[PDB]
Amino acid sequence: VRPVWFPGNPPPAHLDGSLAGDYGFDPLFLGQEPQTLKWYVQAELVHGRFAMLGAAGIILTSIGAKVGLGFPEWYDAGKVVVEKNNIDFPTLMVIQFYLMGWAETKRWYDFKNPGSQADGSFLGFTEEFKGLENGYPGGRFFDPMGLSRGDAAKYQEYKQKEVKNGRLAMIACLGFAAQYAATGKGPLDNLADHLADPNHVNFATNGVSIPIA
Amino acid sequence: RQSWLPGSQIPAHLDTPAAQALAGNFGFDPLGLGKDPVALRWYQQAELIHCRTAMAGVAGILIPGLLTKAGALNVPEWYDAGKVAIENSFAPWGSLLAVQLFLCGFVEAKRWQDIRKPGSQGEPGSFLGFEASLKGTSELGYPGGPFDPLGLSKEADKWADWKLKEVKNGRLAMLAFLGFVAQKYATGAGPVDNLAAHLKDPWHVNYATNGVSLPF
Amino acid sequence: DIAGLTPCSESKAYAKLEKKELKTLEKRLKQYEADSAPAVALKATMERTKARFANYAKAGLLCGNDGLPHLIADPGLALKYGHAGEVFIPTFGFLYVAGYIGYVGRQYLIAVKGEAKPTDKEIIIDVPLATKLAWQGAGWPLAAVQELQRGTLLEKEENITVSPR
Amino acid sequence: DAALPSWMPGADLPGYLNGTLPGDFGFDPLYLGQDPVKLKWYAQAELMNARFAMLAVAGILVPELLSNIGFSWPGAGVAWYDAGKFEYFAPASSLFGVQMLLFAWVEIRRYQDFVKPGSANQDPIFTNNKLPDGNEPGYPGGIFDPFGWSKGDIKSLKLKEIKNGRLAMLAFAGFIGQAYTTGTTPLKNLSTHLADPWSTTVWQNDLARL
Amino acid sequence: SRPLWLPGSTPPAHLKGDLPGDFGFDPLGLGANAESLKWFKESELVHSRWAMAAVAGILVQEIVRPDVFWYNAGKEVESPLGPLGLLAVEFFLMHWVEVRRWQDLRKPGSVDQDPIFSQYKLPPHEVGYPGGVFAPFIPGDLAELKVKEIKNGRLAMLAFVGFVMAAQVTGKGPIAALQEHLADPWGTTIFSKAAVVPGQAVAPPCKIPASVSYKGIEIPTPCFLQGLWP
Amino acid sequence: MKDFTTYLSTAPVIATIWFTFTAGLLIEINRYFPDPLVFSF
Numbered sequence A: 001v002r003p004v005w006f007p008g009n010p011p012p013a014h015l016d017g018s019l020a021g022d023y024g025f026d027p028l029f030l031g032q033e034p035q036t037l038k039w040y041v042q043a044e045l046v047h048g049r050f051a052m053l054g055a056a057g058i059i060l061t062s063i064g065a066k067v068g069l070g071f072p073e074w075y076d077a078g079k080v081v082v083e084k085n086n087i088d089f090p091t092l093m094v095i096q097f098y099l100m101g102w103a104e105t106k107r108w109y110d111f112k113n114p115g116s117q118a119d120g121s122f123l124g125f126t127e128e129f130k131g132l133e134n135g136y137p138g139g140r141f142f143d144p145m146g147l148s149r150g151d152a153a154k155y156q157e158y159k160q161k162e163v164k165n166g167r168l169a170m171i172a173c174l175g176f177a178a179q180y181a182a183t184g185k186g187p188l189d190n191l192a193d194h195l196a197d198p199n200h201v202n203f204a205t206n207g208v209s210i211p212i213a
Numbered sequence B: 001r002q003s004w005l006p007g008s009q010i011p012a013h014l015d016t017p018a019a020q021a022l023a024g025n026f027g028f029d030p031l032g033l034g035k036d037p038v039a040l041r042w043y044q045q046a047e048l049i050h051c052r053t054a055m056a057g058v059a060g061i062l063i064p065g066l067l068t069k070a071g072a073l074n075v076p077e078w079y080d081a082g083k084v085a086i087e088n089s090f091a092p093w094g095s096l097l098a099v100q101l102f103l104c105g106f107v108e109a110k111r112w113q114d115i116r117k118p119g120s121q122g123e124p125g126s127f128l129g130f131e132a133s134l135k136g137t138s139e140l141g142y143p144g145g146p147f148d149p150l151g152l153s154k155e156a157d158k159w160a161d162w163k164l165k166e167v168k169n170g171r172l173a174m175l176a177f178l179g180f181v182a183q184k185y186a187t188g189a190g191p192v193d194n195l196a197a198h199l200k201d202p203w204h205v206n207y208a209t210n211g212v213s214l215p216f
Numbered sequence C: 001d002i003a004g005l006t007p008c009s010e011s012k013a014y015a016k017l018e019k020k021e022l023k024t025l026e027k028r029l030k031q032y033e034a035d036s037a038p039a040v041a042l043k044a045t046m047e048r049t050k051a052r053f054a055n056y057a058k059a060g061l062l063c064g065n066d067g068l069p070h071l072i073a074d075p076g077l078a079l080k081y082g083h084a085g086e087v088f089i090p091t092f093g094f095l096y097v098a099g100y101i102g103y104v105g106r107q108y109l110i111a112v113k114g115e116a117k118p119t120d121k122e123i124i125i126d127v128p129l130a131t132k133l134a135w136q137g138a139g140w141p142l143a144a145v146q147e148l149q150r151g152t153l154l155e156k157e158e159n160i161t162v163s164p165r
Numbered sequence D: 001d002a003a004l005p006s007w008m009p010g011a012d013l014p015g016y017l018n019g020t021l022p023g024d025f026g027f028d029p030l031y032l033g034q035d036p037v038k039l040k041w042y043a044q045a046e047l048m049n050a051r052f053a054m055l056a057v058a059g060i061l062v063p064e065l066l067s068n069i070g071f072s073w074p075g076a077g078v079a080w081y082d083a084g085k086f087e088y089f090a091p092a093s094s095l096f097g098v099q100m101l102l103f104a105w106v107e108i109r110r111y112q113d114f115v116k117p118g119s120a121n122q123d124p125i126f127t128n129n130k131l132p133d134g135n136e137p138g139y140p141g142g143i144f145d146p147f148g149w150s151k152g153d154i155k156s157l158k159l160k161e162i163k164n165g166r167l168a169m170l171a172f173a174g175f176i177g178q179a180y181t182t183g184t185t186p187l188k189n190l191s192t193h194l195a196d197p198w199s200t201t202v203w204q205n206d207l208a209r210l
Numbered sequence E: 001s002r003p004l005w006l007p008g009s010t011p012p013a014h015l016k017g018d019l020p021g022d023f024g025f026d027p028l029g030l031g032a033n034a035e036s037l038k039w040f041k042e043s044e045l046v047h048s049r050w051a052m053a054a055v056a057g058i059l060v061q062e063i064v065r066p067d068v069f070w071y072n073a074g075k076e077v078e079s080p081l082g083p084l085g086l087l088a089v090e091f092f093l094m095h096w097v098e099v100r101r102w103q104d105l106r107k108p109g110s111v112d113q114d115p116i117f118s119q120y121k122l123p124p125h126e127v128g129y130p131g132g133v134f135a136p137f138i139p140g141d142l143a144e145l146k147v148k149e150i151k152n153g154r155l156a157m158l159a160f161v162g163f164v165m166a167a168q169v170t171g172k173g174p175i176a177a178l179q180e181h182l183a184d185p186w187g188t189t190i191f192s193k194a195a196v197v198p199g200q201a202v203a204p205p206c207k208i209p210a211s212v213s214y215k216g217i218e219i220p221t222p223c224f225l226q227g228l229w230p
Numbered sequence F: 001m002k003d004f005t006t007y008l009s010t011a012p013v014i015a016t017i018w019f020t021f022t023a024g025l026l027i028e029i030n031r032y033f034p035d036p037l038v039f040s041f
């Protein structure tokens, strides 16, 4: 009647087929309460968007570092950036904290009171910060092409695609971290090592992943 | 509504029409300190005195600092002006502080007794005719008369604007003095020297680069 | 030189004690290798000892005939001779925190008094209310003196006393 | 909103700028003069800064114009930012003294007509000497119009006044900017731009300065 | 009915065929919103016209001045009017005309009056098609001409992208690279320069240097998305 | 998990969490600021 992560197992009661990417996966019943579930929806979406950006950036810089262009790998790019350019890391870090604190506090107090942030308090901007749904702000600023507007079915499809590519990118970033922890080289370094000899070059032949042998 | 946090629950004691009449009520009370109306009245007075004192002091810090940085004056930095000002003085700092404490406690006790009982310093015969002018106005903290020579409170059309300007410039100057203290403790140079050093290289000369503010 | 005490910067037993502790630690150190975990640990402990003694001697402490730092609890003797940060300033540093704890507890009790089952909000903490009060109780001296000046800090004699009062 | 000329044809004009003020082009992107009394002050403030800026930029250009033509003054050729260092029959101390005293008279007169129009239209000494009634604050009239203007054509004349005035305000701001930037006299800067207009733009000078 | 980009496809519901060039291609649904579709329509129009003039300019340049390279033709002009005065005049005049077009976009009937001379103004027209002094001598119907304009413009947009990538991977001009393709069809295509296989990636080198001097500075001139190249 | 979070709101669990947090804060203070006998800074 609907795709479920563990087939046969019926979905829990709080996971109806209303949210994007709903497959009934809550074996710990973490989002049982609706307000907590809204908080976790926004958390999944922010994590997945940040992870989509992160995975795309890692993939692109690894593409540029593999073909021989002057690119550091994702585990070395911060040092290279703050050392090549004369960048002070505490200054940059607190600049980022100021900007992200403004943005995320706006988003926070639109979670706590959804109608807010649109009173013209910020700079007169009312309808750019009104917010469409929980985790989907929309507006002229976060949606200049208006893809949430117009067609609704296309918007639900894009929601599914967004959350699904986001979970995939989160898994991909966790995989980047684990592969740097294991093989010590870049992600596409690992990919080329796999494509060279798929057998005999994989996680079973690290020495760290399977410690038995 | 002019909230300090646009989405926050403004406390109920700052939403009452008594507190919304106060100058610059942007609903900032995340500690619930002026919940009692008598306490809020006393704290309005405290904010006003603190903000006027801070505006005077921060003027006397940056204006002559800006004029000795512009070569117009030779006033030293504020954290050293007392030492060199008491050397050219007729008095030591102890006797000067004694006279200052007497002359300040007198008027501050007058203000105290006017806060405790509004308009009470104007009961006749207390001063030698000047008590006629010490009754203050309907609004506490805005005494007027001898303290308002240019009659700028008699218009009743810019009055809320005057109050808002006063309290906002005053909160700004309170923060400015707190920053002067912090920057004397942190950089050791003058506030205008700090401004020049930041404007020369902002991305490398700031509180993120000294080894005192962020010690990690 | 408040109570005949010598400053720790010029005390001889203080230096003798530093040398004694460092001699003990290097006696333990000589049995280990150059760069081993025991050797690095003992070197770190020696450095912590040296820094501790240097920082106590720098802070203007007064040492006795035993070389140990002696604190000055008297305000007036501490504020005059530069020993306020020994007992006197940490006094208010404590009292702020302690009255803060007590005021948050009082506010929580007064808050849960009005509910239907007030005792169940004491075995089961209302963490939202508790955190809200724990954050907004940082102004406990001002709010406490304002509750005191209004007379709403102390209960009247509706207190449960005994037959002979 | 009306069919008056605007600073941005098609912009949402604010509304409180209805055209009653000379120079109404709806330019209030900060919405500064939203209050009526604020605008009643700002009108006269603009007019005074404007007239003082017109006098100012006249005193900037014309001295250097008669210098670059080659006339005869003892204070000829000297810049406007080096005219404070010039010496005269008196030091600048007594000059500021007399200047501030006379201006404390006349500006307080102007202010007393501003807070109540019709007040200061008469002399202390000569009661018979008077300014006529019906004049606005900022436009005193009477002996201030001794050559017979302002009978008609008053709206366009006020428009011309405020237009040349805003232009001279911008001119003096540019004089400050170029005297701190180029280090030369402003008419020498004009001549420098007229020599090589394409490589003596502000971007080129700023980039060669850094 | 109308000719679609896919002959058997049903077009999106917002694409009813009313626009000039509505061949039913909105697979992402970017013009689903009615308000953003107008901005995207004007964007297509100006991208079209800019790319058409740009392609004609590169073509004419490689015809009548083949010694210069259009990718390099910024540093090989050396006008006496300065590199900054050029930027100044173009910045100011383009800011003027583009803000006028933007005010046509925001408020449609607003900016038609000639500001300086009061007696001229444009007629009330559509958004994106001013007419009047812009458009004398219309050779035929208007809708067919708009269709032709947008089609030649889309072809010119793709043509400028091809120009850029063929100037990057070959270092030659459009007509020069076309003569290279005609001199060896099977050996000069992008398929014959590049190949990625599961085990090997062959990206062609770009003949555009990483940076050009241009009078005492270092202008960074990177190939477009090298690395992502095949 | 409303009941589970109610359980974590009980007196002993909240005390464990709060005293773990307090003890860890004091411990990290005493790590990064070793041997604080007086208020010198």
Ligand code: CLA
Pocket (backbone or CB within 6 Å): B172, B175, B176, B178, B179, B180, B182, B183, B186, B187, B193, B194, B195, B197, B198, B205, B206, B207, B208, B210, B213
């Ligand atoms: C009144 C506002 C004000 C202003 C304009 C400045 C300006 C400056 N400060 Mg000071 N400062 C202030 C308040 C202020 N400070 C206060 C209240 C504190 C105590 C928390 C400090 C503590 C402080 C230290 C310890 C240091 C500076 C330094 C500096 C300079 C670099 C900025 C920096 O490192 O981050 C400033 C640090 C902060 C913690 C920011 C506090 C500002 C608060 C949040 C209010 C202002 C916000 C306001 C909305 C925007 C500015 C208003 C302005 C337009 C009027 C710069 C000249 C550094 C310096 O001297 O470099 C040469 C430096 O080492 N400041």
Ligand code: CLA
Pocket (backbone or CB within 6 Å): C097, F026, F029, F030, F034, F035, F036, F037, F038
């Ligand atoms: C009751 C008597 C008593 C007293 C007065 C002390 C006093 C002290 N002991 Mg001793 N001790 C005692 C009993 C006592 N102890 C007992 C019974 C034992 C056996 C368990 C010990 C075992 C012991 C050891 C083993 C050690 C001490 C140490 C210390 C020092 C700790 C200083 C410190 O932590 O700085 C803390 C400084 C602060 C400023 C923190 C104050 C608290 C808060 C955080 C301040 C608020 C700031 C801010 C607003 C918080 C932010 C809010 C947050 C939620 C974000 C101090 C001299 C240490 C030392 O070196 O002694 C010299 C040490 O190593 N003690």
Ligand code: CLA
Pocket (backbone or CB within 6 Å): E050, E053, E054, E056, E057, E058, E060, E061, E064, E065, E068, E073, E074, E076, E077
């Ligand atoms: C996208 C438009 C565009 C752009 C940015 C360029 C840019 C360039 N062209 Mg190319 N060109 C274009 C279109 C364009 N061209 C078209 C459409 C043609 C065919 C007519 C040409 C024919 C052409 C030749 C034959 C040559 C260039 C050259 C050059 C370079 C120097 C230009 C110069 O010296 O002009 C100087 C400035 C002028 C001549 C004044 C412009 C003429 C008047 C004022 C008309 C402008 C207004 C007019 C109404 C057009 C507005 C509509 C617009 C949207 C098209 C420069 C790299 C030269 C080169 O390679 O450098 C050595 C060169 O030899 N171009």
Ligand SMILES: CC(/C=C/C=C(C)/C=C/[C@@]12O[C@]1(C)C[C@@H](O)CC2(C)C)=C\C=C\C=C(C)\C=C\C=C(C)\C=C\[C@@]12O[C@]1(C)C[C@@H](O)CC2(C)C
Pocket (backbone or CB within 6 Å): A025, A026, A027, A028, A029, A030, A047, A048, A050, A051, A053, A054, A055, A057, A058, A073, A074, A075, A076, A077, A078, A170, A171, A173, A174
């Ligand atoms: C894996 C992950 C989360 C996994 C969560 C899972 C499985 C949750 C499972 C469950 O809860 C549910 C669903 C339901 C419960 O009932 C059951 C369980 C089982 C409990 C998140 C990753 C989240 C990952 C994120 C957010 C990654 C962001 C990455 C970024 C920003 C990368 C940035 C950079 O790499 C670049 C781009 C370039 C570098 O040079 C600089 C840096 C900064 C290093």
Ligand SMILES: CC(/C=C/C=C(C)/C=C/[C@@]12O[C@]1(C)C[C@@H](O)CC2(C)C)=C\C=C\C=C(C)\C=C\C=C(C)\C=C\[C@@]12O[C@]1(C)C[C@@H](O)CC2(C)C
Pocket (backbone or CB within 6 Å): B028, B029, B030, B031, B032, B033, B050, B051, B053, B054, B055, B056, B057, B058, B059, B060, B061, B077, B078, B079, B080, B081, B082, B173, B174, B175, B177, B178, C139
């Ligand atoms: C009076 C004042 C400064 C006065 C300065 C003077 C006289 C300076 C004088 C001198 O320099 C000169 C002129 C010349 C020098 O040579 C000599 C001296 C003498 C040195 C500063 C006040 C400075 C006052 C300050 C900084 C007060 C800050 C208060 C804050 C932030 C309160 C925050 C909150 O209380 C609210 C608002 C609501 C709560 O619910 C939440 C919280 C967050 C608790």
